[PDB]
From a paper:
Finally, we present the structures of the types IV-A1 and IV-A3 effector complexes bound to [name]: We show how two Cas7 subunits recruit [name] for handover of the NTS in type IV-A1. Inspection of the cryo-EM 2D-classes for the type IV-A1 DNA-bound effector complex revealed an additional density on its belly side. Structure reconstruction revealed [name] at resolutions ranging from ~3.5 Å to ~7 Å, which could be unambiguously assigned to the helicase domains (HD1 and HD2), as well as the FeS-like and arch domains. Examination of the [name] interface revealed interactions involving its α-helices 19, 21, 27 and 28 and the wrist loops (WL2) of Cas7.1 and Cas7.2, along with a loop extending from the palm domain of Cas7.1. This conformation places the arch domain near the center of the complex and aligns the HD2 of [name] for receiving the NTS, which extends from Cas8’s CTD across WL2 of Cas7.1 towards [name]. At the center of the interface, tryptophan 494 and isoleucine 657 of [name] form non-polar interactions with isoleucine 165 of the palm-loop in Cas7.1 and valine 56 of WL2 in Cas7.2. Only arch domain R440A, HD1 domain W494A and HD2 domain R653A substitutions caused loss of CRISPRi activity. Analytical size-exclusion chromatography confirmed that the R440A, W494A and R653A [name] mutants are properly folded and soluble. This suggests that the interface formed by the HD1, HD2 and arch domains is crucial for [name] recruitment and subsequent transcriptional interference.
Type IV-A [name]-Cas systems diverge from this general mechanism, using a nuclease-independent interference pathway to suppress gene expression for gene regulation and plasmid competition. Here, we present several cryo-EM structures of two evolutionary distant type IV-A1 and type IV-A3 complexes (from [name] and Klebsiella pneumoniae, respectively) bound to cognate DNA targets with and without [name]. The structures reveal multisubunit DNA-surveillance complexes that intimately recognize their DNA-targets to form an R-loop structure.
Author numbering:
A (entry chain F): 75 to 222
B (entry chain K): 480 to 718
C (entry chain A): 1 to 221, 237 to 343
D (entry chain B), E (entry chain C): 1 to 222, 237 to 345
Write the structure that this text describes.
Amino acid sequence: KGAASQNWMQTSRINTAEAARHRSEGFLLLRAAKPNPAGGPFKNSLYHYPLVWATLTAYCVGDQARIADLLSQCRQIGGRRGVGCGRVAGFSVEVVPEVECTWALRAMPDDSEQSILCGEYALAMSALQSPYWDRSLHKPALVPTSLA
Amino acid sequence: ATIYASDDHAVLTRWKLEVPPARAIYLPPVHPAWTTEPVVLHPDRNAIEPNDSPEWADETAGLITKVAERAAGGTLVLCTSYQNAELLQGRLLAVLGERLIVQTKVSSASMCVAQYKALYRAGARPVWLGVGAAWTGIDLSDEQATDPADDAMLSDLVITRLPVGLNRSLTHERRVAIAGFKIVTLEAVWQLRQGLGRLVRRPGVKNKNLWVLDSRIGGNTPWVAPYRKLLSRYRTAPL
Amino acid sequence: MQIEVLIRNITPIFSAAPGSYYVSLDGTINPPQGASRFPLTRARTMTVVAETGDGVAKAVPLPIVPGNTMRNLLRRTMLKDVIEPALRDKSAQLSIGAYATAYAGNSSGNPDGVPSSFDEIVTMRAHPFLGLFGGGPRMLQGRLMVDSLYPIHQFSQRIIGSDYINDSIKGGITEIVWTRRNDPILQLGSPDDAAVIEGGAQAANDWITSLLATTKAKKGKGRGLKAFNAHEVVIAGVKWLWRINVDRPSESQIGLILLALNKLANQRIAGGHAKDYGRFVIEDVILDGESVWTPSGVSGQATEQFFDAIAEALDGMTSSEFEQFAAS
Amino acid sequence: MQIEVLIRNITPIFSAAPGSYYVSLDGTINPPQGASRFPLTRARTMTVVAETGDGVAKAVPLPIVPGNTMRNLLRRTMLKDVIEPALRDKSAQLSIGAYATAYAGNSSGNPDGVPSSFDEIVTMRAHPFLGLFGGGPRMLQGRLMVDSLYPIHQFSQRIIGSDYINDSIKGGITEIVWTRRNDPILQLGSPDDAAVIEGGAQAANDWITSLLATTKAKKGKAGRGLKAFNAHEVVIAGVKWLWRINVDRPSESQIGLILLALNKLANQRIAGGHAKDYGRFVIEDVILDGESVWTPSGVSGQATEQFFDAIAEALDGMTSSEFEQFAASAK
Amino acid sequence: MQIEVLIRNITPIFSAAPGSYYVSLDGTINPPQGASRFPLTRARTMTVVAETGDGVAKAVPLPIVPGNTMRNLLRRTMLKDVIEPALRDKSAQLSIGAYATAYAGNSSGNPDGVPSSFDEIVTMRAHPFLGLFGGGPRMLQGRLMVDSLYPIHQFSQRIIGSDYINDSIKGGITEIVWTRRNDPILQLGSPDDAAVIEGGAQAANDWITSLLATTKAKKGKAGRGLKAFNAHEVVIAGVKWLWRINVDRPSESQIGLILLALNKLANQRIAGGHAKDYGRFVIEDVILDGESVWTPSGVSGQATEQFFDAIAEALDGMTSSEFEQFAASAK
DNA sequence: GCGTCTCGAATCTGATGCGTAACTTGGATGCTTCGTGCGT
DNA sequence: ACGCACGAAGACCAAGTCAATGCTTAGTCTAA
């Protein structure tokens, strides 16, 4: 992190006066008398996610040319890309000696060999192949403690 | 030679010379090995602020006098303005005498550079106190000696100031108003790099020496960091 | 497809930052306990790294407008300026699920979670409006990726770029505006003023007595109308750059974006409706490096196809498409 | 709907800027501690971006009138000259809470926090007066977008546009005025003047002795006496101003109400300085959606005829029940 | 209610602007440091916007009389001509605090922090005098708007309108008057002249020798003696002035009191220069809501009879009880 | 038809007070289920 | 005649914080 993490705040709300006007004019078919900001169609919601300035470095085994070509079309990193978070100023792909840092800092399968693991590995539930948010694909896996 | 800066990425060029944002294309920087390696910087820093005080002139004159005594051959002392040179030439003339030659309002590269070239070939070990004009354009390569590695007509050179705010164009004032003090610092970095352009104008130079004379580089003030980065490319003299 | 919109705000832009922050009369943010403190609603500032004061890197706050606010503003502009009139022209009516999906992408209409067939995804992601803003019970991935409204400032050089260096502002761009609320009863001066009040002089006397008693009790240890406070806003006249990208856009979607940009000037940015904050005028719109902003709005020979496509889409648009998208 | 009002102030406009400021007798703001300083209440200035002939954009102060202050001015003008006379013609009475909410937007400092029904929102936003300002115990979004009072100045050219350049003023438009308070007892000169004072000579002697003792104690140390000498900063008279009013999808009744307010606005005053007759102004031109609708009589013409008819009908049908419903707390 | 008073000054008007300004002996204001730097007390001027015939908005100074000075002049006129005779006949004596509050708007420099009850506000705002002049420990808004005394000049045409073009003056209306103070002892040059001073000629010789020593020491260095040479800048005599007094919703008695003051206002001075008989003026015309109500005798006519009558009964029923209530502290 | 001399000089060259007061010193919302009954 | 409206209700502990940015000094002549 080039700077401390910033807690970013975003909300969600349907304009109640605009909806009332549409309800009056027949654009909206709602018979309910009042909006409910606590829940339902007109719920106001408050959520937060952290924003960080960072340089993304990771290690892999593959083709330099093809990986560089794939990363050429990448414009945004991480998530919340619809609101423009994590634009890519640039990228670099370099060949480095194996002794620097291994590719093991990831979700390895449960019975992975100890010799290839860099550092401590805590057992947890995570997916081994992308997509990683699919909870039906979640399996017990060794997740690096010094990276989570 | 001063298009791309260390961190500006030629933005100053695109702004000074207005170019459409899409029409401009940058190029990677290049530098031959014989441009940075064959020179070492002496750690003889200046102990006084580069003002116009007579005592600062005395100390700088003594430092550059011992440099000239130690100088291998023809040397160049980079003076920013006529005010500093005139304040400095009086002390030098006591020891150097005729060996020192300085620009005037009339004296310039019309004949002074030719005279310096002739005197250097004569073995006088001449000292050229450049003022503004000598900062850019004039040639200090011993073209006749086609080794080419002679490194004697400009064996040594000394800088008296960074400099700071040499450009006085109203466009520069507009730019410094728009962007702040950052632009003038990197413009002075450009000027300092331009002054180093006098050091080499032929390939295969082998051994030259450099002196820095400004207490600001030794005062550890935050804004001279780009100058530190620029001079850090050059190995210091192991004194 | 990259859209670069150069926005200059005529009036100050006020995006309220969460939190209870205080200020003193002299203007000191978060004054110490010694002096009086007044509540302050600061502008939305994002911590960014920049070369401030010839430093290598400084994490200085930059007053911006959140990207989600810009996204919602664009959605509201489309809805209130092209989509809603087009649906009204057909006398279309939307259920609560379809309307919630259309105006906030809320899945309340069918929170069960509906599968989407590949043909359905192809048809719907090609919708001129709902494709750009995914959501609803289906909850697709929208084709619109709008950036935050970063001001053209010295600290935003590494976020905006150096293409618009001529319009940058060196100093701070935030100013504190003080508000005040006065009790109308204390400003009565004659029985003619109190004629409209049903209680006349007696009601005003009771109101003032209650106010005095409450104030005395509060001093010794129900809140009245009187209030003094300030809110921080970004100074007017500063130029802003808005970057919009549409991933794999159809002609209809680009036409809709151009129409929204045409009608965007009539809307406001962020908050401040009471004080007419956020008013702005579009200065330049850039499509894939080509300037398109004419003095009469977005026009030109290179955008007629988008306008024709979006007009054709508006001609044949029906509420049934919204219902199908919202699974209603 | 965009309304642009062109205002030239007959008397200087003085809007107090919060915070303590000091000035010396010469006129130097925030003088060095060595010189004598006097309290100063500066005219409120909002930082704005101004472009010059050099092309550089810089932040400079600009003396303006806050949007909130003259929004309240417009509300008070409407209530005093259009709404309240209409209510009093039919002998309609408002409760103290209804009056407080009509004049300030709330009956108390604690909002209800309960959402309003859709039909109530539509009815209130269709009200000629309540629709413009909204507010109430349950926050209702008003239709009136009202802007601050920007003087037509070289600094405000970027803000107010270049179509009013003919009325711009180049130099500074701010001047400082000094005020003094005198102890009346120090101007007594005969027992006839002190004959009306109870006790007379004894009372005056006690007052002067106490004043001298207090001043001597204050001087040696290095309540408050009547003597005072300070200054307050005002905007010079004769400068033109631009007022911009926007309404979100206005009904004809609300447009007519705003036009009537503009007709009756000249009798009111913009900012503070009631004793010094500050804030007096005359409206020069009113622009409605890019069209001038101002005559020497005022807002008039067939273009504004329908707005006036609609607002007259609404006022004839205007009752206190709407205000009582609007200001009724949901709790 | 608008009242316009046309005032012409018989003698020069001298309202001194605070600040130390210097003038050379040839009339140049703020000369170079090389020349002499005699002190000057300039007349107070407010910058105003005026057209020089080309329609350009040029900010130029204008020698005026402060509005606060005129307000206090009107207050003093009413008190010393109307209120004081009325209270005296009934043997009603104001307390020292009531006297100070009436003559200065406050009995001390620390106003109360609590608002006043509505009954008190109604009673005070209806009072013939206290209603016009607000103030007191509880900040109360008065009914009087006193404007500055703007001279009818080409620069003030934009401010005061084009109604008084025939009375406008083009050239500068400001002049410098030189003042010198002599040391009496130096002029004393007879043994009979010194026959009154104790010690005879010895005291005069000691005075002269002390003066010589002091001036020699001060010149060598490069108290203060009696010798002086100064200058004060005054507005020339004979120019016409426009005075605007505006009152919001007045009772009959208050307007009657204002008219009574205007009848007896000419006997007072405008501002400053008591020793040199500065500030003398004569009222040319009084405009009452667009109608001239000024007779050669004074404020008279069939139109204004009811105001005078009403203020007459108001004075007859007046007492000191309301003054004591107004000036009483609420803490 | 001019006529020239003289065609200034010294000295003052500011003093004193006042040189803030009171009050506001935030307020509200951001949850779904469950039972019972309308109800279009 | 299943769908939607609408109040009551049930979890219920509970702090420490609230800046993030200051910085200097005169040569050019090679188009009217």
